[PDB]
Amino acid sequence: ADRLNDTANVKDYGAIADGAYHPLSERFATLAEAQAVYPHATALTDSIDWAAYQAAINSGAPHVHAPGGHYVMNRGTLAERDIRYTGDGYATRVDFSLADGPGSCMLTQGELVQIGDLSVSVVKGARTLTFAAAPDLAPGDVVIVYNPANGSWLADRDPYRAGEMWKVHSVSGSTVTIYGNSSSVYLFSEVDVYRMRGVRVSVDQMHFSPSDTYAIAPFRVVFGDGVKVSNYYASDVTRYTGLEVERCFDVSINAVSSPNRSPAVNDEYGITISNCHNFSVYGGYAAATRHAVALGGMDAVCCVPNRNGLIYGMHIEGIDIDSDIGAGDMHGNADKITYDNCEFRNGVILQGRDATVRNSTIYGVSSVSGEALYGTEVYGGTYTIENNRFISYGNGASFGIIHISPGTSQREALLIIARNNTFELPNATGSTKVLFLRGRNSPLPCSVNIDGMHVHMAPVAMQCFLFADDQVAATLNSNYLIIDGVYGPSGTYLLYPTSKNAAIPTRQMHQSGAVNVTTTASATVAAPAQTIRYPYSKIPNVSVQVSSQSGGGQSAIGSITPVAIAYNVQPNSIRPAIMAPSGSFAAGGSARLHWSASLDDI
Amino acid sequence: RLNDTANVKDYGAIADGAYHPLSERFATLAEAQAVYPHATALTDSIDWAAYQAAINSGAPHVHAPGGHYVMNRGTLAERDIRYTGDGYATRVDFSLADGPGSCMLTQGELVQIGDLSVSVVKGARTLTFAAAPDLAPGDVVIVYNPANGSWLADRDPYRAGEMWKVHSVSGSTVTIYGNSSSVYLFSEVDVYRMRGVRVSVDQMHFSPSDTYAIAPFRVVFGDGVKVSNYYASDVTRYTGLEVERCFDVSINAVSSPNRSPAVNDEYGITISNCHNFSVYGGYAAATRHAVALGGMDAVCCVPNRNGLIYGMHIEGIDIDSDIGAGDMHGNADKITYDNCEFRNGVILQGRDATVRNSTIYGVSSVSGEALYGTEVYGGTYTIENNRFISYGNGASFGIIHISPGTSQREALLIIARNNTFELPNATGSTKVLFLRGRNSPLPCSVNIDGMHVHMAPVAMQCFLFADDQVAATLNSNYLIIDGVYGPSGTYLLYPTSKNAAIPTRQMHQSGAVNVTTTASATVAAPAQTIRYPYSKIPNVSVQVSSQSGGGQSAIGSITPVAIAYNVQPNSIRPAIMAPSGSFAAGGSARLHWSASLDDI
Amino acid sequence: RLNDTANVKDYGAIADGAYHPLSERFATLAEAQAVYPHATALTDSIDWAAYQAAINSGAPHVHAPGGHYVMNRGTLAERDIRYTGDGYATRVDFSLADGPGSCMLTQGELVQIGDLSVSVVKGARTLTFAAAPDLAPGDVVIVYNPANGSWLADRDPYRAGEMWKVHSVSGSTVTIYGNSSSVYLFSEVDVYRMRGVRVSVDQMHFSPSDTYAIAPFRVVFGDGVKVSNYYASDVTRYTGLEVERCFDVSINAVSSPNRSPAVNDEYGITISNCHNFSVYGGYAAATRHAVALGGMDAVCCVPNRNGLIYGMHIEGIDIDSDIGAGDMHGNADKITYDNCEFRNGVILQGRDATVRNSTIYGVSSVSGEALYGTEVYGGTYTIENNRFISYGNGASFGIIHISPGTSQREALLIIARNNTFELPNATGSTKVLFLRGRNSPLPCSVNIDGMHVHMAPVAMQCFLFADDQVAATLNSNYLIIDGVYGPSGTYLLYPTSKNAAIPTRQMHQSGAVNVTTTASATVAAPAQTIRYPYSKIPNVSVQVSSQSGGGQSAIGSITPVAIAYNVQPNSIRPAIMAPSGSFAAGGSARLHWSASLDDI
Ligand SMILES: [Ca+2]
Ligand SMILES: [Ca+2]
Ligand SMILES: [Ca+2]
Ligand SMILES: [Ca+2]
Ligand SMILES: [Ca+2]
Ligand SMILES: [Ca+2]
Ligand code: NA
Ligand code: NA
Ligand code: NA
Ligand code: NA
Ligand code: NA
Ligand code: NA
Ligand code: NA
Ligand code: NA
Ligand code: NA
Ligand code: NA
């Protein structure tokens, strides 16, 4: 920068910003005259507000301030360097309604360039990269490995491609020390390697409205490193999205208010994070037709998964539509994304690998089923669902309240961890399934650990706490199904048994009871069948014992030493009994028959 | 205006910490008014006159450079506005102001619209009006029940109602973002449109009126309100900050202490009748409530709802009528504290109240209640992953004490999972979780799973105490008490006539004891203590092995038949019997036992 | 002051990334000093001279517009101050500065006051002085024990003490916000008053001295410190940011990487002897500790206390002496990490240390320890709702490894509830949680509940290993191991002579096996494997049913009597006996069993 100023105020550069379109023709008779002031002008139709804005950026000033006003922009702006954008709050409205075509937005874009190849394959947990020749990298650069094969992350969509970003600590010869560690295997002959020298971009106290005609965010950062978004507003988001960051590293978004209100067609996102690493979204209010927070991807080099994302302390709202979908998104190109301490009105999506939601209030979508947590684009790894309060008005019948359904694209074993959750299901029926695991010709094991599943307001026996099958295959491939720490209506199966899950090892909650009996003149005195509140999927492991009715001292019953046995054991009932060693009891004696049950295959 | 930023000093402020009346500068009121037309009296301060002049320019951004502004009148803005200062050095001091509006007030728009024609059900995602409504996308629509106590009877201004942002309107049908928490009968509610103001404050320090109880910075009918890097001092009467009847409010990095006498309020920051609010990343301190969640008495004084308070350091002081530093008045629905520190105490009231992930101290009362609530609507009270520390005895009030009354409107469920309790002064009267209905009209049920008591020096009364203070019995669907640890002799549930009929699930326990046979038909082991006694006779098992665990069948010539010879809530005698005849004296065995309750 | 915003370029800075000595502008030192009285030599840089001149103006707000400021001296401010820049483009570079104070320093006031007359107890909420104290509301009062190692003996500067904000003073009694974590004997402590500076920094980039180990931006004796949108680069020696002996510190959206050789420290950001601090919303990276929680050696170098680190991405690198990226030195009390990513490793040390809701990787050592601590005071170490991933073997050091020594001051309780452990390189020597006292003087007790091991390829050594490396026995009140899942053959607790006497509670297990009778008095099933072996003989039940579950009583002419024929820690033989005589061969039954331990 041989720049003349450090802060550029857009109005000093000629902006009118009175909410009307003012072409350069209002001020200049010819294009040549206009270009003598604004060399970047291409036509006299170009708006004065745009010409001024781009002039301010072209000054080189690190800080570009747009004072209060309604800037009517019929072209996008471009910055390719570190920049801090500010306004006066909601009063600074930057409106791209009239802009059309690629780049119809406030775009800031860093540098991405392909570098030399690796000579050593990256393993999971690796903390160095080794190159065939000394790499063109310096401390602080971001290095990206990228697998250009379609679907190399997940086959569900071609742009779901594998790869990863790391910040560079140091370089020694041909070995690069990276911060963090590798989530995945990257074979050296399969991946291309890039260097990202990202731009540091900040936005604060500004309000944007997007193009009416072209689906693009009104403020967009590409190849950012150290991106800061605060106190950011959108309005008239009538097509696509209010904000997007793409192929960025180290992104912090807080106190945003960026609602989408577009027709439900293909996207409809409040804010959009695309192919980013080390991002945080907190302290704000997100709203949309479909996804208030959208975690997606685009189709370009280094379109690697969203990874290492923390979305927390957010109010996340959507609306009822025909094809109901959760307001908190996660597209399948996701790894190590965690929602924590959020409200979802309504619904959350867990997809990709290593997906987590904790400490949240989560509503079922307004479908017949009322699924509150849904995912199909499932890579595998661990899906963690902990300390949430779920509320649904649906029936959980065709799709579960939690519904996780991997398909042929699954790449690793899946483990679903669901611990200490509450489920408020006032419209539950005998078909309701609280957690529904449904493989769709899944190729690898899918296993479940439920521990702490408290169902509130259910008016009748439900189908089950857990439903587990494969819709296509003859059996579900799984290592275990654990169902523990449940509460709900009597008659609700722990696991609904089918031929598809009968072979899978299972652990099912311990249950117990006792019943008073009066003896008959019989060798065996069996209680009537005692109901098991939450039926097992198969005959449980049981105990039975005898005491007095009161718990006072008692040994013999009449002249008989009573021998406790399990006379009948069903998945849903038990008949404890006592037998005489020889002969028969006398009629009229008294006892209490105790029983317990569990399954513990793992 | 020429400038979209108005700097208060550029409008004449002195801001040197002294009172400068306009009479210092102008000989007559007319002369003053020729410069400041808003001036009313020559006593009005120059700092105030400048500040209102700045706002009156219409500038979206009003900046008060460093200085001590001595304001003896309040300021008013009724539009979107961004306020800034230079940090703690920008001190806007309303000490000398008295009367209504003795503050920096920013206020939006609220107007009544037409009535609904369809009752709103729980979970509803549209509203239907009798005629096409005067709403546009982005407006906030508020339903309001003007009947006193229509949320909770405890206080007349605890009225029912709800705010939603408008997505779209088709005919008479409005599509709302989010969903309805409640039933709203169309003949019982009024409907309002709120077109709120976007208000920001950053890098400013306020001091309130000395005489009139009003926050020094107040936003009413805000939408998209942003507060950061905000300080208060000399908060000697009421509060340091208030937002009222706002939607979408974000408060971070605040340092707004209260230090007023304990009388009627004493709030660090105050959130009154707001929806979709967040408070994080800050330090809150007060005499009573460092963070206060309250309400006022005006139209659309609906419950605080959908609130997230997280990552906060929340401090109070010891007072005579001890009360938690983290407040929740009864006009609260779906308020969640997460990852906070409370030195000392939190309150859970209203409906669907939550605290998770927090370090929570007992107040400095005899009882040392750490979590308390009485103005209880119902729904689910969730208490998870906390570490509680109390120096009290938990006797009259529990360490967790939840006590709904006649005002309860829905069944209550208390969920207390994976909590730790550090109770170095526990006694034989200590109750860890005390559910006490006060003539409650509806069921109150409990699920405790994971309750680890540390440092208790003696047997406590119980992990759970559950009763109704007035009624003959407690109305409840279940009491579950599982995953506990504490001193031996502590009841899982303390049994009384008031709770005897309630279905209960109680932690599995077990043991074993070696015995030597006597020349008897029955050989009963000594009484084995049940560490955490049950509320009634448990469901039991008994078995027999060798003492070593090596192979053993017959004992002498006798096939031993395991039985439960006696069972108490606090002990058991497992035994073995001979099928006929007697054992010989001197045989050896080990008798095993287990116990649980599982009514639900 | 003539100025409220001072712009450093208006005060003369060039800031073009080159060193410009004052000699470029002034022929003589007399002329330089006439403009810049603070100039000491003509070699002093123009950028530095301008920056110090801007601070010396008294302006509350000092703005450094975009530029690369080449500072060959440090700056000093001793008052409330707001620093701003234009973002990453404002680069304040102290590379060329050397010696003490080679940084942007802002420092408040600390003075010794009068002594206490009453010892402070745990939970105390007032302080009583021998004479009326020199304190006012809002001040911070600090008690300090100057004896070396008075917090932990491990290091001399780990001294006891505490900070509180003053609410009010009545005679000689001070009312404090919050409460006392500790006992402070009045004869052992000195008392100080801290009148801290309110300091803010936003939108700035720093680089440190090349030669002297000091943060480039440093606050000492701050109160209400605010850091946001802060960057560092070329952190080649020590750290990018440090706050020291501050109260109420909020740090968000920082990007401050360290990249120094692994020698003695290597910290991204550093918090030293602070209270009521929060770090959130950012990205921290370093050679050793991305977030460093340490201390210095000076008066009032009290423990870090009441700290919340949340929603952070925390990264380190592989080094020879692997160490966790999320630090906690032993001088820590009530520090909580929540909802963070650790690539790789976290440390829990001091007292009352917590990590929840986090994704935690094992460091790149042979053992792959993910959570480590040895400078252990005691209290409660809470580990909840985490997902651990390690590529190590957990053999010499556990995945979680907590190892108090002789310096331990209070009983230790480790609470590990609902964690998941991904251990693809686990072996028969792997220990998930390893408690290892090193001649510990006080009890160390464990509650594991919910420990789910994923990807382990073989039986591990144990879920819990607990011993003392030095003493003949481990001093402990209890070891609870519940809610586990992992490979078959993995011990719940690995038994040794050192832990054999400790009360234990171990997960309930069960099974069943079909048998066909022989012509025998006793029909025993073969040994049934217990998936997770107990540390000693479990408490068992056994029963008999039909194989189908259909009705069955007698087996031929025999009433079957269930017994525990053999019980080992790792297997069981349920059996049935005839009361007299023998079964006939060829009858059918199903023998059920269960097991648990519940000493506590
Ligand atoms: Ca669209
Ligand atoms: Ca629908
Ligand atoms: Ca008051
Ligand atoms: Ca008190
Ligand atoms: Ca160093
Ligand atoms: Ca290493
Ligand atoms: Na022309
Ligand atoms: Na119910
Ligand atoms: Na008004
Ligand atoms: Na209108
Ligand atoms: Na309208
Ligand atoms: Na009232
Ligand atoms: Na009405
Ligand atoms: Na034998
Ligand atoms: Na040092
Ligand atoms: Na028996």
Author numbering:
A (entry chain C): 145 to 746
B (entry chain A), C (entry chain B): 147 to 746
Q: What are the paper's exact sentences on this?
A:
An equivalent fragment of gp61 of phage phi297 (residues 1–142, named gp61d) was cloned, expressed, purified and crystallized. As expected, the structure of gp49d could be easily solved by molecular replacement with phi297 gp61d as a search model. Gp49d and gp61d display 32% amino acid sequence identity and can be superimposed with a root mean squared deviation of 1.6 Å between 572 (or 97%) equivalent C-alpha atoms. The main chain traces of the two proteins are virtually identical except for a small extra loop in the C-terminal domain of gp61 (residues 693–697). Several N-terminal residues are disordered in both structures: 168–180 in gp49d and 142–146 in gp61d.
Bacteriophage-encoded depolymerases are highly specific enzymes, acting at the first step of phage infection and serve for specific recognition of host cell receptor, as well as for the degradation of polysaccharides. The polysaccharide-degrading enzymes are primarily virion-associated proteins like tail fibers, tailspikes, base plate or neck, whereas some are soluble proteins, released during bacterial lysis. These enzymes target structural polysaccharides (LPS, capsular polysaccharides, peptidoglycan) and essential components of the biofilm matrix.
